Amino acid sequence: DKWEMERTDITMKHKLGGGQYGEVYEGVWKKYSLTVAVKTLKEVEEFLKEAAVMKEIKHPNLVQLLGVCTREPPFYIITEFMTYGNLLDYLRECNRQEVSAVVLLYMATQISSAMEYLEKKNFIHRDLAARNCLVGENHLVKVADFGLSRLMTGDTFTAHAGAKFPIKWTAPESLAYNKFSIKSDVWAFGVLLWEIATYGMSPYPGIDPSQVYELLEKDYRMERPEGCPEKVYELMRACWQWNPSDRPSFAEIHQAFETMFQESSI
Numbered sequence: 001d002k003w004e005m006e007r008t009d010i011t012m013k014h015k016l017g018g019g020q021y022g023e024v025y026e027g028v029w030k031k032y033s034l035t036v037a038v039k040t041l042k043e044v045e046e047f048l049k050e051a052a053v054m055k056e057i058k059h060p061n062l063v064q065l066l067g068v069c070t071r072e073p074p075f076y077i078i079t080e081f082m083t084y085g086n087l088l089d090y091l092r093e094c095n096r097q098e099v100s101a102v103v104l105l106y107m108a109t110q111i112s113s114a115m116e117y118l119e120k121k122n123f124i125h126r127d128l129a130a131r132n133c134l135v136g137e138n139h140l141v142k143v144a145d146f147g148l149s150r151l152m153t154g155d156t157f158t159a160h161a162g163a164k165f166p167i168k169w170t171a172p173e174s175l176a177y178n179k180f181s182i183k184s185d186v187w188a189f190g191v192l193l194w195e196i197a198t199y200g201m202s203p204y205p206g207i208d209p210s211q212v213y214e215l216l217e218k219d220y221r222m223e224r225p226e227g228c229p230e231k232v233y234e235l236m237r238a239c240w241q242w243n244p245s246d247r248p249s250f251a252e253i254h255q256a257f258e259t260m261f262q263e264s265s266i
């Protein structure tokens with residue numbers, strides 16, 4: 001197809017993000033003199049499914065596929081390079097006078113726009129967090145999308161026996177029953193909002209992940225971050241409803257943040 005590329009079109013450099021994303025490398029697309037990101041493999045069928053899924057993703061706030069090398073090993077998935085790295089590090093290291101309250105709303109609007117698209121197109125993320133959001137010039141935020149899965153919106157997925165999750169971002173139904181849906185992404189988005197409001201603080205600070213579920217089932221939720229608007233915190237708490245069906249859709253969340261962003265600008 002139009003996606004299939006020669007492997008030699010790309011010059012590979014060093015592993016990006018300190019290796020936290022696995023075999024993902026900075027690279028040069030020589031023809032265009034363009035810095036790109038390249039995921040390689042050095043499981044096969046999982047990798048090639050990722051390549052297949054990425055071909056169908058087209059949204060301003062989801063990392064764009066540029067091409068693939070899927071004929072013979074080594075296999076490549078080639079995407080745009082996000083110059084400022086991930087949102088977690090960006091928030092921690094930023095100039096807060098430049099990255100102000102309106103910018104935080106702008107970033108939340110972008111992420112929710114992407115998540116509304118996945119909600120519309122029957123995709124599930126399963127690992128929404130600041131570390132999996134990527135930053136470009138002018139506070140452009142794109143959701144990392146290698147591991148997106150096909151799942152009709154409303155349907156559920158059961159994780160494998162002995163699967164380990166990032167507990168502090170993980171919905172109660174996922175922790176207890178390994179159940180994932182678009183509504184568990186909504187929960188994770190709530191935790192992501194908390195990350196944004198605190199400029200990249202660790203969720204449930206000082207609380208060991210092994211004790212988080214027990215707090216959640218006793219009705220504990222993180223308190224409102226300093227400087228966070230009441231309206232934004234009420235959205236967080238709505239994302240953290242125990243019952244998945246009680247949580248808002250990403251369509252409703254995006255509409256709320258778009259309104260808040262527009263009013264903050266005016």
Ligand SMILES: CCn1nccc1-c1c[nH]c2ncc(-c3ccc(N)c(C(=O)N(C)C)c3)cc12
Nearest residue numbers: 016017021037063080081082083085086144145
């Ligand atoms: C498809 C989405 N995805 N899933 C995993 C990785 C990517 C990704 C795509 N394009 C990317 N472009 C950049 C980065 C990235 C992230 C963190 C970093 N510290 C760095 C970095 O070292 N510098 C030089 C800024 C680079 C990650 C990705």
